[PDB]
């Protein structure tokens, strides 16, 4: 049940006139759909085929921690989860609030402006303050913009300065840079949207 | 027919008084002794139990060598060899010139202390200018005076700096030592026979 049912509450009714409200919601799937082709394929062999040429126990192990703590592939993975929870908190404040105050007051519009219009400005604040956390450490984490093909790693046990190399670091660049790029156009969009509600107030 | 020998003509009859003409020519024996125990012995393992702590191919041969260009039971030999060659190249020098002179002018001493004790004393020149000519490079190719356990080593096809390990060497040491010592003492007594032959001209 992933994707088709946070669209029922996100693929909201009626809310603005911008043509950047589906716009940014047709990427986040697009980019869930490159992310689940890239994750289940060309991180596999992060771990596997990651060579240390040392014969010293600890090394390869360490080697792959100090140099990739929280891999590539569960970092996109974050970012969509978080960039998710303001779209789908907001959605979920919705369909409680009106479903709520409706039925209630109906046997015994302001605050659908006020309470809804209001939150959901402050979601898209969050969705920009998420996407570009990540696109932050994503950025400063990771030695540069991409990955090289091997790293001299020191981590503790190996021998002095060891070589190890990766798997396709390409193919994993790739990667980076549309999931990177996708992660720059889906923060304009949330910035816009940010900027029309702050240019009408 | 090794050792046995060199005695027949360098045992010689009766050259010189100072009680330091045996004495060198016993620890001459007493150091091939030596050598004959360490040579087949320890250092069969030199290259064999080597190890460098890298999968990298080329390394550990290119390892050993940077590190043992002549190793030491092979600098030892030498040493044996060319200062035991002034002993019988003199000895050789003797019983021929000896024979020759004598079974010359017989059918048809001056010169027995001329030729051959002034030839002699050059020997004995070189012998240690040979004792040390070695002693020199056996304390100068050889970082420092002994073997560490490990190395480190930077030998070319070896990513980076790897780890090696010597066999027994503080046996290696140990050996060295003696014969490092021997090859000292076998110096002065080299000098004395030198320093009697510069007292009395």
Same mark, same amino acid.
């Given at each position: 049940?992933?994707?088709?049912?946070?669209?029922?509450?996100?693929?909201?009714? &009626?809310?603005?006139?911008?043509?950047?409200?589906?716009?940014?919601?047709?990427?986040?799937?697009?980019?869930?759909?490159?992310?689940?082709?890239?994750?289940?394929?060309? +991180?596999?062999?992060?771990?596997?085929?990651?060579?240390?040429?040392?014969?010293?126990?600890?090394?390869?192990?360490? =080697?792959?921690?100090?140099?990739?703590?929280?891999?590539?592939?569960?970092?996109?993975?974050?970012?969509?989860?978080?960039?998710?929870?303001?779209?789908?908190?907001?959605?979920?404040?919705?369909?409680?609030?009106?479903?709520?105050? &409706?039925?209630?007051?109906? &046997?015994?519009?302001?605050?659908?402006?006020?309470?809804?219009? +209001?939150?959901?400005?402050?979601?898209?604040?969050?969705?920009?303050?998420?996407?570009?956390?990540?696109?932050?450490?994503?950025?400063?984490?990771?030695?540069?913009?991409?990955?090289?093909?091997?790293?001299? =790693?020191?981590?503790?046990? =190996?021998?002095?300065?060891?070589?190890?190399?990766?798997?396709?670091?390409?193919? &994993?660049?790739?990667?980076?840079?549309?999931?990177?790029?996708?992660?720059?156009? =889906?923060?304009?969009?949330?910035?816009?949207?940010?900027?029309?509600?702050?240019?009408?107030?």
């Amino acid at each position: 049940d992933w994707g088709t049912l946070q669209t029922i509450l996100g693929g909201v009714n &009626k809310h603005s006139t911008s043509i950047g409200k589906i716009w940014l919601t047709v990427l986040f799937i697009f980019r869930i759909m490159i992310l689940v082709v890239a994750a289940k394929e060309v +991180w596999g062999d992060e771990q596997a085929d990651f060579v240390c040429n040392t014969l010293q126990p600890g090394c390869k192990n360490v =080697c792959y921690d100090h140099y990739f703590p929280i891999s590539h592939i569960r970092l996109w993975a974050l970012q969509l989860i978080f960039v998710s929870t303001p779209a789908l908190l907001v959605a979920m404040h919705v369909a409680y609030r009106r479903h709520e105050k &409706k039925r209630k007051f109906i &046997k015994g519009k302001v605050r659908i402006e006020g309470s809804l219009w +209001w939150t959901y400005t402050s979601s898209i604040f969050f969705r920009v303050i998420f996407e570009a956390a990540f696109m932050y450490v994503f950025y400063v984490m990771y030695d540069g913009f991409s990955m090289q093909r091997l790293v001299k =790693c020191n981590a503790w046990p =190996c021998p002095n300065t060891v070589d190890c190399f990766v798997s396709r670091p390409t193919e &994993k660049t790739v990667f980076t840079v549309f999931m990177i790029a996708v992660s720059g156009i =889906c923060i304009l969009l949330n910035v816009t949207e940010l900027c029309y509600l702050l240019i009408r107030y």
